[PDB]
Amino acid sequence: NLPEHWTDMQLFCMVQLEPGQSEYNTIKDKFTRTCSSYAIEKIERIQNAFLWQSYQVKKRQMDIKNDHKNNERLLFHGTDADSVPYVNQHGFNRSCAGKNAVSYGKGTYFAVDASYSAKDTYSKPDSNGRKHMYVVRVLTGVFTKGRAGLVTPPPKNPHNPTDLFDSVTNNTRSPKLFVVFFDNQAYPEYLITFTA
Amino acid sequence: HHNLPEHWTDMNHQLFCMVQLEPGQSEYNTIKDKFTRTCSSYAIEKIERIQNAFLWQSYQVKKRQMDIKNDHKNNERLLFHGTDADSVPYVNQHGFNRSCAGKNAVSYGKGTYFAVDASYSAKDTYSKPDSNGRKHMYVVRVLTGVFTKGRAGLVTPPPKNPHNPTDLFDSVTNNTRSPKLFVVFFDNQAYPEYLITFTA
């Protein structure tokens, strides 16, 4: 049930990408579009079979529920070096997320621009100057402007409270961040290690 | 497909249905006996089978993953969860969410709590009685897997060895020798299989 472009594996692997290959170049270009002042050390493909299976089941469900296939975005997530081993194995856990400086809900935050996740607040430099940013497939689905009190996405309709938006954002006209409130709604696909 | 169980009834191509069980038939009897083993003084108004296809699919995926991870198929337990009436629509559609509001204490970790005996979930503090005196308890398939003793402040189960901090226990409990409650810390580790509506 695994993608054909993964290396043959074991249930988990990190795969170092080669510059000049299209897969590496597309990630670098997306990163450099707004992060021209940093320099990438390496880009690794996260091959996590269990996280992939759970995420893809959730994506198929959202595609059915919403009756279209533009539920997924490729977003960024900066984090500290100490969180990287957990995210590689277990993904993003809302119960560990820090509070965002503009909070649109209690969940895991993903950024449209790498420049946002490049802030030392998120991708905290380690003692060797290395900063860490995931590139994440995120099931954003149908979204609305969040509120700091949210622990789940809000209902679309107050008289049917269990029929929920899939995620929330900071601005529905010009989205710069998305917040997801459920496990396996985000698959960490690449880990960018970079430096000033 | 969704690998739906054989005992579910036809849903006319729909994906979520609550099906009221027929008293006196084998399925109703099995669930009622698990309840009355510790709650024989309560009065059961009805038992509903929760047929949530998306919740079931995601739960079975995690079960297959846990069965491979632990290299055995003894990772599931049938447990009880009492809750207030206003939370039943969410649980039916979405399962158990560690993040939701609650006044109850989280002495063994910030997860969702499941009881071994129905009589524990029958307390008013969990199955809070209705404006009409009715109480609600789920019978839950729970992926307890390999467990250890819990403690306050856990946000995930602890690792099974400090040297490999990402290899975690699957759940925690109050007492490993003789468990009375289990706590799980992730979505789709618990499928709500039947809803028991009852009175004291």
Ligand SMILES: NC(=O)c1cccc2cn(-c3ccc([C@@H]4CCCNC4)cc3)nc12
């Ligand atoms: N059947 C039950 O619900 C149950 C049986 C035995 C012990 C239990 C403990 N709880 C419990 C229920 C809810 C909570 C928290 C309260 C704080 C917010 N998130 C839910 C913590 C513990 N539920 C129990």
